[PDB]
Amino acid sequence: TLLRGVSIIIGTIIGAGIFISPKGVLQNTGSVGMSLTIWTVCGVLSLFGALSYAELGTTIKKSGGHYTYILEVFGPLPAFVRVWVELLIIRPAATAVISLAFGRYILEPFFIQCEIPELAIKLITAVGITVVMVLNSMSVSWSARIQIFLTFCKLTAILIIIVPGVMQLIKGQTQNFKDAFSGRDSSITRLPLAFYYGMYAYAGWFYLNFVTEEVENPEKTIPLAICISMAIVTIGYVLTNVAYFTTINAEELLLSNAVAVTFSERLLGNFSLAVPIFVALSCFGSMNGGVFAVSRLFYVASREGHLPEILSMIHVRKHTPLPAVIVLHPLTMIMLFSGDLDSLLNFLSFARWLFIGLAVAGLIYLRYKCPDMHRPFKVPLFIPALFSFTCLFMVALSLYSDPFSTGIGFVITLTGVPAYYLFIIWDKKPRWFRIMSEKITRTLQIILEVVPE
Amino acid sequence: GLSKEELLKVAGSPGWVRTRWALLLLFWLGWLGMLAGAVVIIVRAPRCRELPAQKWWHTGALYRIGDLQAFQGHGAGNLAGLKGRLDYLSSLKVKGLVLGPIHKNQKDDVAQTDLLQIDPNFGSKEDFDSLLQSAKKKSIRVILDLTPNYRGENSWFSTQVDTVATKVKDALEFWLQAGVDGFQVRDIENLKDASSFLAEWQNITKGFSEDRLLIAGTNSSDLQQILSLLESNKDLLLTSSYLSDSGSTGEHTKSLVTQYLNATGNRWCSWSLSQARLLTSFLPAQLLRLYQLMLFTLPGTPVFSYGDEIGLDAAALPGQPMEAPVMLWDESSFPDIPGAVSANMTVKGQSEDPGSLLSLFRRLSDQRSKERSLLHGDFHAFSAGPGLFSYIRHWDQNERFLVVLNFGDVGLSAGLQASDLPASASLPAKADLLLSTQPGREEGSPLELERLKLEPHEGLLLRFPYAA
Ligand SMILES: CCCCCCCCCCCCCCCCCC(=O)OC[C@H](COP(=O)([O-])O)OC(=O)CCCCCCCCCCCCCCCCC
Ligand SMILES: CCCCCCCCCCCCCCCCCC(=O)OC[C@H](COP(=O)([O-])O)OC(=O)CCCCCCCCCCCCCCCCC
Ligand SMILES: CCOc1ccccc1-n1c([C@H](C)N2CCN(C(=O)COc3ccc(Cl)cc3)CC2)nc2ccccc2c1=O
Ligand SMILES: *[C@@H]1O[C@H](CO)[C@@H](O[C@@H]2O[C@H](CO)[C@@H](O)[C@H](O)[C@H]2NC(C)=O)[C@H](O)[C@H]1NC(C)=O
Ligand SMILES: *[C@@H]1O[C@H](CO)[C@@H](O[C@@H]2O[C@H](CO)[C@@H](O)[C@H](O)[C@H]2NC(C)=O)[C@H](O)[C@H]1NC(C)=O
Ligand SMILES: *[C@@H]1O[C@H](CO)[C@@H](O[C@@H]2O[C@H](CO)[C@@H](O)[C@H](O)[C@H]2NC(C)=O)[C@H](O)[C@H]1NC(C)=O
Ligand SMILES: *[C@@H]1O[C@H](CO)[C@@H](O[C@@H]2O[C@H](CO)[C@@H](O)[C@H](O)[C@H]2NC(C)=O)[C@H](O)[C@H]1NC(C)=O
């Protein structure tokens, strides 16, 4: 129904991006004002893209995912390179960013106003990831009721910042926004970097997987729920940046590594160790949304020709996907012990917004060059055109921004095509190869005890 | 791929179950090894020292406004016009405000004059309340001077001493109820039994609250006359003329500052050149940038006079009182002898030049008030070239600062052989540069600390981070 729809969207779309983002948004812009315009532009851009995915996924009506939206509007290897670049770029670098924030925010009651070694962080993040994966490889029934509690934890983590940020606003009228649009004299070649940091704050809608006859009166319920429960997030996310700027100047925020602890350290009350616990629980709630929605993606991709059938096999008792965990873990650990947040956001965001822009352009290409295949609801022609235009322009301009961290994503998606004809368009090039790879699947299927059920 | 029933009869074998129990225990031992390594890298971490919980007059500079009439202009010299300049004062980022004696005083009769009633030529009690509320809004503290005979020669009523002592006791209890943040008394060498009265006044000032100040001001240049005033007091800020006698060579000023810090025992002090004069009355026109770099980077509170940010000269202008020169806000401040001012002789003409003197004041007054190793860092000078003065500020692990000054008109190199500093903040090989007093160097260009060649009257503000 309606209220459970806005509840599930408000639960999947907020998280801990509001603690990672506003330092990288301010750094790649100038003053407070350009930052707040970026934080409200990204909200309506995410609204437009969410409306486009909802209008696109109820016109194809297949078994979910925008892997099956690039396929059936492009067919071959455009949809192969998406599922290649997924498990090689996007998902390891997505887990290795929320984990790096989580590990940072629990070492704060032990390093009060002092500096932390990085190797103390990384070996705590690499404990939290494995505890997440061991929890996922056991029963799913505990793994969802834990998630519900972490959803209420991330709501309270937003709320205990948004309440004392307005009690400082209507009291004395404390203002340091004065000169709002006066920046640090230029930001034009690193504008899309801020686009990469704002959109990460709203991430989550592109795993929602809308299927038509499950919500009551579905001709009008889905776009109404999306447009209400996206503008609610845009309100709650701009007032939180107002709450951050109401107590911190624009120069303390660039030298700080955790803005939610310097908000609390000057807004005390003798339990200001609450917020590095609740920001940690909000960072854990996004980590726990891990191997799931990768598993059903592996199930759909394994059903045709891609991603060999050992993946999307299932443990016999306690029917949980183990080889997705096995293939995800030594990749996110490699990317975790490598470079920092500012490299990983760029390295994932390049490929991620490139493929979402391709899919929402394919929505238009299917709308005009196939005027059949009826629509339960439609959007105006300017909405996905504008979203795809901004996506592809920011991704293209991001190559003139730091190219030794995003150009590796470009060379990986261009080695996607020398990995396509070698593994899809061919027929058993050695016999030294198939008989070798059969024993591989046999041995590790025997070790993991996994069946395709 | 193997199906269900062909799998359970192979993966139930001996061997196949023992290898997976072995791999499971190997994975768990790697996990607990990572946990124990993270714990031992947390514990083997160096401690971190505790911040001193400073007061407000530790955090910035004080700005003495002696004559209020000549601060804005004649006819506009009331307390109401002072409210339009507090934005300019916050642009300077001064933390306090030492207002002049605004009380009523006629002349050498004590019975008519009174430290309780405001003179009507300055404003009202309601306007003083509005000043205090607007200053508390901008977070600028107001310190009220209370010298009794501030219109005359002998400021302390040299006939008797009892009534002038009792009336200050009534004065400190009166104004603190209104909400002032401190007090200042001047020329206390003309006050008999001074260290006994100062301890009583300091008691009353600390007895209202703990965040209140008392500033005493002498004219004595002698060190032993200064330490005798600091026998029963620790919280007293004492401004004297201790630095204004000489300083033509760097060895003399180096010996002066280090001897003062050795004698008082590294306590909180106040670095100033006078009690009511400007910087230009004791220095030539070229040394103002060097002394403004020095006075902001020394361990204590710097106290400046009004106009010292723009190089306000009185001897380079016509007929004026040498103790209370007129302030040059614009190109039309100085009314008579027209055309005497210039573009560089005023505030707004210096509020746009990047290589100006007021820009150096604003670049130093925020680095003093924001950075942590200049707030309460340590102090260690060392030997250097014959004519230089070089020192280092460092707090715990924060950004180390290095200041190198040239008190002479010669071309000298630095030659920094440290060899005696603590092992925490010893000299690095290469360090950055924040600013210089002269044009001709770019900001942010790291140097190596060997061929540091100095042009005459140059000062530097190198910095380097904590490493080993
Ligand atoms: C710097 C960025 C951060 C770090 C990133 C590091 C990336 C390293 C490269 C990893 C490449 C992994 C590619 C696996 C792609 C599998 C694609 C696929 O669908 O294979 C299908 C094929 C047939 O299966 P089936 O349909 O018959 O069941 O089934 C198979 O092909 C079975 C073989 C599966 C393994 C494929 C190995 C490919 C080797 C790629 C060369 C690079 C590594 C070489 C290592 C050599 C060491 C000996
Ligand atoms: C510099 C040093 C480098 C060292 C290697 C670094 C890479 C580490 C890779 C770690 C992979 C992720 C490990 C996740 C472990 C699964 C969690 C788990 O305990 O599963 C429970 C499962 C069922 O238990 P039970 O019901 O039998 O008691 O219990 C089981 O199913 C037992 C079997 C699974 C054991 C998992 C150990 C690793 C599996 C190896 C599979 C084949 C490896 C192929 C190459 C993969 C790496 C490139
Ligand atoms: C966090 C997102 O998932 C949830 C959302 C709400 C409640 C629970 C979950 N949840 C779910 C549930 C059973 N779900 C499955 C996937 N789900 C969609 O893919 C959106 O389906 C839509 C339905 C209606 C609309 Cl209008 C749009 C999309 C929605 C429901 N399994 C989990 C499994 C492992 C860990 C966490 C969760 C988990 O948290
Ligand atoms: C004021 O300083 C005096 C000594 O410098 C201290 O003790 C006070 O001494 C006076 C007599 O000179 C007494 O009248 C007070 O009652 C004393 N204060 C007490 C006993 O608390 C003391 O350090 C300061 N006084 C206060 C109240 O802080
Ligand atoms: C500090 O100011 C006084 C006032 O001009 C200087 O002169 C002293 O004045 C008092 C009475 O006004 C006399 O009792 C002293 O004997 C005077 N001192 C001397 C040395 O003549 C005093 O000289 C000034 N101090 C300095 C260092 O300039
Ligand atoms: C000035 O600093 C020096 C060290 O730089 C110290 O001099 C010491 O003075 C005491 C008492 O006269 C002697 O017992 C020590 O042997 C001296 N040490 C050295 C190294 O000379 C002291 O801190 C200060 N001197 C005075 C007289 O206050
Ligand atoms: C303001 O700028 C003028 C122009 O540079 C200064 O006038 C020069 O002053 C120097 C030394 O004071 C003399 O050597 C030059 O001969 C002067 N040139 C001219 C054209 O006047 C003036 O002194 C500056 N004002 C201040 C206060 O520094």
Side-chain angles (χ1 to χ4, degrees), chain B residues 195-226:
Chain B
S195 43
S196 89
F197 290 129
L198 280 161
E200 164 174 350
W201 294 342
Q202 171 85 280
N203 255 351
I204 305 166
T205 301
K206 293 304 158 182
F208 200 88
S209 315
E210 83 286 339
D211 58 353
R212 309 303 214 244
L213 196 42
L214 175 81
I215 306 175
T218 76
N219 70 323
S220 42
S221 163
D222 170 68
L223 181 49
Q224 308 293 312
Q225 208 147 338
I226 285 163

Coordinates of all heavy atoms in Angstrom, one line a residue, chain B residues 195-226:
Chain B
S195 N 51.5 47.1 45.1 CA 51.3 45.6 45.1 C 50.3 45.1 46.1 O 49.8 44.0 46.0 CB 52.7 44.9 45.2 OG 53.4 45.5 46.2
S196 N 50.1 45.9 47.1 CA 49.0 45.6 48.1 C 47.6 45.9 47.6 O 46.7 45.2 47.8 CB 49.3 46.4 49.4 OG 48.6 47.7 49.3
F197 N 47.5 47.0 46.9 CA 46.2 47.4 46.2 C 45.8 46.5 45.1 O 44.7 46.1 44.9 CB 46.2 48.8 45.8 CG 46.2 49.8 46.9 CD1 47.1 50.9 46.9 CD2 45.3 49.7 47.9 CE1 47.1 51.8 47.9 CE2 45.3 50.7 48.9 CZ 46.2 51.7 48.9
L198 N 46.8 46.1 44.3 CA 46.6 45.2 43.1 C 46.1 43.9 43.5 O 45.3 43.3 42.8 CB 47.9 45.2 42.3 CG 48.1 46.4 41.4 CD1 49.6 46.4 41.0 CD2 47.2 46.3 40.2
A199 N 46.6 43.3 44.7 CA 46.1 42.0 45.1 C 44.7 42.1 45.6 O 43.9 41.1 45.3 CB 47.0 41.5 46.2
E200 N 44.3 43.2 46.2 CA 42.9 43.3 46.6 C 42.0 43.5 45.4 O 40.9 42.8 45.3 CB 42.8 44.5 47.5 CG 41.3 45.0 47.7 CD 41.2 46.2 48.7 OE1 42.2 46.4 49.5 OE2 40.1 46.8 48.8
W201 N 42.4 44.3 44.4 CA 41.6 44.5 43.2 C 41.5 43.2 42.4 O 40.4 42.8 41.9 CB 42.2 45.6 42.4 CG 42.1 46.9 43.0 CD1 41.2 47.3 44.0 CD2 42.8 48.1 42.7 NE1 41.4 48.6 44.4 CE2 42.4 49.1 43.5 CE3 43.8 48.4 41.7 CZ2 42.9 50.4 43.5 CZ3 44.3 49.6 41.7 CH2 43.9 50.6 42.5
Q202 N 42.6 42.4 42.4 CA 42.6 41.1 41.7 C 41.7 40.1 42.4 O 41.1 39.3 41.7 CB 44.1 40.6 41.6 CG 44.3 39.2 41.1 CD 44.3 39.1 39.6 OE1 43.2 39.1 38.9 NE2 45.5 39.1 39.0
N203 N 41.7 40.2 43.7 CA 40.7 39.3 44.4 C 39.3 39.7 44.1 O 38.5 38.7 43.9 CB 40.9 39.4 45.9 CG 41.5 38.3 46.6 OD1 41.8 37.2 45.9 ND2 41.7 38.3 47.9
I204 N 38.9 40.9 44.1 CA 37.6 41.3 43.8 C 37.2 40.9 42.4 O 36.1 40.4 42.1 CB 37.3 42.8 44.1 CG1 37.7 43.1 45.5 CG2 35.8 43.1 43.8 CD1 37.8 44.6 45.7
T205 N 38.1 41.1 41.4 CA 37.9 40.8 40.0 C 37.7 39.3 39.8 O 36.8 38.8 39.1 CB 39.0 41.3 39.2 OG1 39.1 42.8 39.3 CG2 38.8 41.1 37.7
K206 N 38.5 38.5 40.5 CA 38.3 37.0 40.5 C 37.2 36.6 41.3 O 36.7 35.4 41.2 CB 39.6 36.3 40.9 CG 40.8 36.4 39.9 CD 40.4 36.0 38.5 CE 41.3 36.6 37.5 NZ 41.0 36.3 36.1
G207 N 36.7 37.4 42.2 CA 35.7 37.1 43.2 C 34.3 37.3 42.6 O 33.4 36.6 43.1
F208 N 34.1 38.2 41.6 CA 32.9 38.1 40.9 C 32.7 36.9 40.1 O 31.8 36.1 40.3 CB 32.7 39.4 40.0 CG 31.3 39.6 39.7 CD1 30.5 40.4 40.5 CD2 30.7 39.1 38.5 CE1 29.1 40.6 40.2 CE2 29.4 39.3 38.2 CZ 28.6 40.1 39.0
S209 N 33.7 36.7 39.1 CA 33.7 35.5 38.3 C 35.1 35.1 38.0 O 36.0 35.8 38.4 CB 32.9 35.6 37.0 OG 31.6 36.3 37.3
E210 N 35.3 34.0 37.3 CA 36.6 33.6 37.0 C 37.1 34.0 35.6 O 38.3 34.0 35.3 CB 36.7 32.0 37.0 CG 36.2 31.3 35.8 CD 34.7 31.3 35.6 OE1 34.0 31.5 36.6 OE2 34.3 31.1 34.5
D211 N 36.2 34.5 34.8 CA 36.5 35.0 33.4 C 36.7 36.5 33.3 O 36.4 37.1 32.3 CB 35.5 34.5 32.4 CG 34.1 35.0 32.8 OD1 33.9 35.6 33.8 OD2 33.1 34.7 32.0
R212 N 37.2 37.1 34.4 CA 37.4 38.5 34.4 C 38.8 38.9 34.5 O 39.6 38.1 35.0 CB 36.6 39.2 35.5 CG 35.1 38.7 35.6 CD 34.4 39.0 34.3 NE 33.0 39.4 34.5 CZ 32.0 38.7 34.1 NH1 32.2 37.6 33.4 NH2 30.7 39.1 34.3
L213 N 39.2 40.1 34.0 CA 40.6 40.4 33.8 C 41.0 41.7 34.6 O 40.1 42.5 34.9 CB 40.9 40.6 32.3 CG 42.3 40.7 31.8 CD1 43.1 39.6 32.5 CD2 42.4 40.5 30.3
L214 N 42.2 41.8 35.0 CA 42.8 43.1 35.4 C 44.1 43.3 34.8 O 45.0 42.5 34.8 CB 42.9 43.1 37.0 CG 43.5 44.4 37.5 CD1 42.5 45.5 37.6 CD2 44.2 44.2 38.8
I215 N 44.3 44.5 34.1 CA 45.5 44.8 33.4 C 46.1 46.0 34.1 O 45.5 47.1 34.2 CB 45.3 45.1 31.9 CG1 44.5 44.0 31.3 CG2 46.6 45.4 31.2 CD1 44.2 44.3 29.8
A216 N 47.3 45.9 34.6 CA 48.1 47.0 35.2 C 49.1 47.5 34.2 O 49.7 46.7 33.5 CB 48.7 46.5 36.5
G217 N 49.3 48.8 34.2 CA 50.2 49.4 33.3 C 51.2 50.4 33.8 O 50.8 51.4 34.3
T218 N 52.5 50.1 33.8 CA 53.5 51.0 34.3 C 54.2 51.7 33.1 O 53.8 51.6 32.0 CB 54.6 50.2 35.1 OG1 55.4 49.5 34.1 CG2 53.9 49.2 35.9
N219 N 55.3 52.4 33.4 CA 56.2 52.9 32.4 C 57.7 52.5 32.7 O 58.6 52.9 32.0 CB 56.1 54.5 32.4 CG 56.7 55.1 33.6 OD1 56.6 54.7 34.7 ND2 57.4 56.3 33.4
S220 N 57.9 51.7 33.8 CA 59.2 51.3 34.2 C 59.8 50.3 33.2 O 59.2 49.2 33.0 CB 59.1 50.8 35.6 OG 58.0 49.9 35.8
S221 N 61.0 50.6 32.7 CA 61.7 49.7 31.9 C 62.6 48.7 32.6 O 63.2 47.9 32.0 CB 62.5 50.5 30.9 OG 63.5 49.6 30.3
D222 N 62.6 48.7 33.9 CA 63.5 47.9 34.7 C 62.8 46.5 35.0 O 61.7 46.4 35.3 CB 63.8 48.5 36.0 CG 64.6 47.6 37.0 OD1 65.7 47.2 36.7 OD2 64.0 47.2 38.0
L223 N 63.7 45.5 34.8 CA 63.1 44.1 35.0 C 62.8 43.8 36.5 O 61.7 43.3 36.8 CB 64.2 43.1 34.5 CG 63.9 41.6 34.6 CD1 62.5 41.3 34.0 CD2 64.9 40.9 33.9
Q224 N 63.6 44.3 37.4 CA 63.4 44.0 38.8 C 62.3 44.8 39.4 O 61.6 44.4 40.4 CB 64.7 44.3 39.6 CG 65.9 43.6 39.1 CD 65.8 42.1 39.2 OE1 65.5 41.6 40.3 NE2 66.0 41.4 38.1
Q225 N 62.0 46.0 38.8 CA 60.8 46.7 39.2 C 59.5 46.0 38.7 O 58.4 46.2 39.3 CB 60.9 48.1 38.7 CG 60.1 49.1 39.5 CD 60.8 50.5 39.5 OE1 62.0 50.6 39.3 NE2 60.0 51.5 39.9
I226 N 59.6 45.2 37.6 CA 58.5 44.5 37.1 C 58.2 43.3 37.9 O 57.1 43.0 38.3 CB 58.7 44.2 35.6 CG1 58.6 45.4 34.8 CG2 57.8 43.1 35.1 CD1 59.1 45.3 33.4

